[PDB]
Design a binder for this molecule. Structure first.
Ligand SMILES: NCCCC[C@H](N)CC(=O)O
Ligand code: NA
Ligand code: NA
Ligand code: NA
Ligand code: NA
Ligand SMILES: [Zn+2]
Length: 866
């Protein structure tokens, strides 16, 4: 399998302007007829090279003439001796029932549906399966009436008919030209929720949400979220929807979260279906986010698409930024920012140090589905957010307007986006472009000095990015470095120099520089890299009392939470080294006191308190170390939780009872109170055993909503309470028929700290609610074990790796994309000790040797063993 490189991009020899598709649908054998209008742009003797995979070619015509000048090659149909403009007609067969990869046209339960991003359209017919080729689609679908009463594709329904033998047909037409990755087709039987949204200029859009029969009671929240998305995009970005219909279809068998197909989004039902007894606050907020995200792609992705796949972050970074802004405007900005920072530092940083490291605009790709990454998405969004930070909102919106003005209707580049932002703002971003092309996490080192003679504060800031496996050369970036300076009383010291105000966003552009501030009347406590103003590691030698001061005084909530993270970080490192020598947890009293003060501050937003009382995850903790000891980290996380539970027991219980709510509402204040309450319950579960068992058991049985119930069950599992087995059995008994709900239970099983967790997980491969044919179940049991139980996955005997190898040996043949998700924990071997490294390398060497090794695995395994 061959690498492709960004520097090889060339404009296509041929374009296609219009394509007319006809599907004669059947699960064993679907006949596709594709009639394309084509235009040559290159040399007169260049053949047309069409992409195609696993297609049975039936015929090829050019202007109605059967064509003899062609041949098949590996992955292609090459057609020679063409005129300058012509009609290509291809007829071919495909087999949806055989498609376990879930790429192209496949079967989801009894429905037929498509997934075409990145390069799945080529599994449907021979085409220019590349996103700089944009065409107007017309799609006609013919199918059995009983099995497939609903026949959907992009755009508007323009024709309809009945045929002999219980078949029917519909035709659809989408007026906007599109790359084929945005093609969708859905056939099946559904319940439908219908609603409308009226845009700000008075267009009435019909909204339609298709779900499995019986699930209409779980549809309204998604519908509500869609309307909220449409409204927000209008208020914030000035963007309206551009068609009279918007369809969403929830399918159960899907590789990712969702897909922005124009006018016809297809969603993993996990990000659509919710009811108060089935879904958590977090589900409600995730459904909102993903609905928003796919909607926001309608402009940032569809009306302006990507010239080639190396430009993915042009749509994904910008769209992720848009979903974060949406969630933050509607909810708590502080909680959003915090959690996104947790994700960046805890998960994306690890990727940017891994063998899979790449810039947000990659230079080399073997399997493009491997690059739908935390880097491309979350670091991508951080890069967009840095642009926003440098330009300010008003200039950033001008840049948006200019990007659309220049590029609407076309496929664009990351470089085109940056250029629009520069031209609209007159801010120079030449050096800033280096964030698109350099991989890895910059390390920013800060040293300070207060001069009492001159009332000057001096910051000396340096940066460097370490080499990564993809890139030996690294250079300084344009790092927006936001600061605030606090005086003795907790008030902000105006920033200034030589009698003039200076911007609190510093431009850190060199390996090293110095900034000097005048009229610093008291020795300050700095807040550094405010709001995580650049996606970097901060190295700065804080005192605990500077950090508690920031926890008590900083003006942004984010800085308080972040000061609390810096405070724990010292003690996490300390106690990990202790654990390794057999020594128990040590924690200064004043640290415990700083958390006690948060529990009892009544001014404090309960959402902030809950974040500060949610300890860094094992993945966030692991970012603190070069070599990771996953067993020591897990045990320290537990011991710290036990220690705080004991020191704060009274305050914990009181805040728990105070935040009781009788009514359940999906509303920002209610969520915040409940999140705090359940953060208290978590500690309490790790406290005195009898009271823990009582509290947890009681919350689980009396809960009127899944958030309160799952928090209890989760706490019983995590603290291994006596009530655990009973509670777990009750939830199985009640919920076994419901896969999305069972996923949560599989996650708890997989992530259990119990000594026999691997054995329990193996047995759960036979559980009535598990199947290897469903990506959600797979991720919930197997993925959650490998990726979210690092202590068990990295058991000293290597049983964890061996289990994953067995699973991947199945999944490589069945569903390579899911396989490639699941291999990620093994790809990180170079963060572990020599003994673990040897075993992980041996596991990877077995997988390298599979017959029919997928490209997806190949790419990762090769980079890992280098
Ligand atoms: N394997 C390709 C996954 C495509 C993801 C799609 N653009 C949905 C999203 O970005 O949210
Ligand atoms: Na075209
Ligand atoms: Na798109
Ligand atoms: Na808000
Ligand atoms: Na510290
Ligand atoms: Zn996206």
């Amino acid at each position: 399998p061959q690498a492709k490189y960004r520097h090889d991009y060339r404009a296509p020899d041929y374009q296609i302007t219009d394509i007319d598709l006809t599907f004669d649908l059947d699960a064993q054998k679907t006949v596709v007829t594709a009639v394309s209008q084509a235009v040559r742009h290159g040399a007169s003797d260049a053949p047309l090279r069409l992409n195609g995979e696993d297609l049975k070619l039936v015929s090829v015509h050019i202007n109605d003439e059967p064509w003899t000048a062609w041949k098949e090659e590996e992955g292609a149909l090459v057609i020679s001796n063409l005129p300058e403009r012509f009609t290509l007609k291809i007829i071919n067969e495909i087999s949806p029932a055989a498609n376990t990869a879930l790429e192209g046209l496949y079967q989801s339960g009894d429905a037929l549906c498509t997934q075409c991003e990145a390069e799945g359209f080529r599994h449907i017919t021979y085409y220019l399966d590349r996103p700089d080729v944009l065409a107007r689609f017309t799609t006609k679908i013919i199918a059995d009436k009983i099995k497939y009463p609903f026949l959907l594709s992009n755009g508007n329904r323009v024709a309809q008919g009945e045929l002999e033998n219980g078949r029917h047909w519909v035709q659809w037409q989408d007026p906007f030209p599109k790359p084929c990755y945005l093609f969708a087709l859905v056939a099946g039987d559904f319940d439908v929720l219908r609603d409308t949204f009226t845009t700000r200029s008075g267009r009435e859009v019909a909204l339609e949400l298709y779900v499995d029969r019986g699930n209409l009671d779980r549809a309204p929240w998604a519908m509500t979220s869609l309307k909220n998305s449409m409204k927000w995009d209008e208020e914030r970005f000035g963007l309206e929807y551009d068609l009279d219909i918007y369809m969403i279809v929830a399918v159960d068998f899907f590789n990712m979260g969702a897909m922005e197909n124009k006018g016809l989004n297809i969603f993993n039902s996990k990000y659509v279906l919710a009811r108060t007894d089935t879904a958590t606050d977090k589900d409600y907020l995730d459904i909102e986010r993903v609905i928003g995200h796919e909607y926001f792609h309608n402009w940032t992705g569809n009306r302006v698409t990507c010239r080639d796949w190396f430009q993915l972050s042009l749509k994904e970074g910008l769209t992720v930024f848009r979903d974060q802004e949406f969630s933050s405007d509607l909810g708590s900005r502080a909680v959003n920012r915090i959690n996104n920072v947790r994700t960046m530092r805890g998960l994306q940083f690890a990727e940017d140090a891994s063998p899979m490291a790449h810039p947000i605009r990659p230079d080399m790709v073997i399997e493009m589905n491997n690059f739908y990454t935390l880097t491309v998405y979350e670091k991508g969004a951080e890069v967009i957010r840095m642009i926003h930070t440098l330009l300010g909102e008003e200039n950033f919106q001008k840049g948006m307007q200019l990007y659309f003005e220049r590029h609407d209707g076309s496929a664009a580049t990351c470089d085109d986006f940056v250029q629009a932002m520069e031209d609209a703002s007159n801010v120079d971003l030449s050096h800033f472009r280096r964030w698109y092309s350099q991989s890895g996490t910059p390390i920013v080192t800060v040293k300070d000095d207060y001069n009492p003679e001159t009332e000057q504060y001096t910051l000396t800031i340096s940066q460097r990015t370490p080499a990564t496996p993809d890139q030996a050369e690294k250079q300084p970036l344009h790092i927006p470095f936001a600061i605030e300076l606090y005086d003795n009383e907790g008030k902000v010291i105006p920033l200034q120099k030589g009698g003039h105000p200076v911007n609190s966003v510093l431009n850190v552009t060199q390996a090293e520089q110095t900034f000097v501030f005048d009229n610093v009347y008291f020795q300050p406590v700095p807040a550094l890299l405010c709001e995580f103003s650049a996606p970097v590691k901060l190295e700065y030698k804080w005192s605990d009392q500077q950090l508690t001061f920031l926890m008590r005084h900083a003006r942004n909530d984010f800085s308080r939470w972040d000061a609390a993270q810096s405070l724990l970080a010292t003690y996490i490192k300390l106690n990990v080294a202790r654990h390794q020598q057999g020594q128990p947890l040590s924690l200064p009293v004043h640290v415990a006191d700083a958390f006690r003060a948060v529990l009892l501050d009544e001014k404090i937003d309960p959402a902030l308190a809950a974040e500060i009382l949610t300890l860094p995850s094992v993945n966030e903790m692991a970012e603190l170390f070069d070599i990771i000891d996953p067993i020591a980290i897990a045990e320290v996380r537990e011991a710290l939780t036990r220690t705080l539970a004991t020191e704060l027991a009274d305050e914990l219980l009181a805040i728990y009872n105070a935040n009781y709510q009788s009514e359940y509402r999906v509303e920002h204040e209610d969520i915040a109170k409940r999140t705090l309450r359940n953060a208290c319950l978590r500690f309490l579960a790790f406290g005195e055993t009898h009271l823990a068992d009582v509290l947890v058991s009681k919350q689980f049985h009396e809960a009127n909503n899944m958030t309160d119930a799952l928090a209890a069950l989760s706490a019983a599992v995590a603290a291994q309470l006596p009530c655990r087995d009973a509670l777990m059995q009750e939830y199985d008994d009640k919920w076994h028929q419901n896969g999305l709900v069972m996923d949560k239970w599989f996650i708890l099983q997989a992530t259990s700290p119990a000594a026999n967790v691997l054995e329990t997980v193996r047995g759960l491969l036979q559980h009535r609610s598990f199947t290897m044919s469903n990506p959600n179940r797979i991720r919930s049991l197997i993925g959650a074990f490998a990726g979210s139980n690092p202590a068990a996955f990295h058991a000293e005997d290597g049983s964890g790796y061996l289990f994953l190898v067995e699973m991947l040996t199945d999944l490589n043949s069945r569903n390579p994309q899911v396989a490639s998700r699941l291999i990620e924990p093994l790809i990180r071997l170079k963060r572990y000790d020599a003994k673990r490294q040897e075993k992980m390398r041996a596991a990877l060497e077995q997988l390298k040797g599979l017959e029919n090794l997928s490209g997806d695995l190949y790419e990762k395994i090769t980079k890992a063993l280098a």
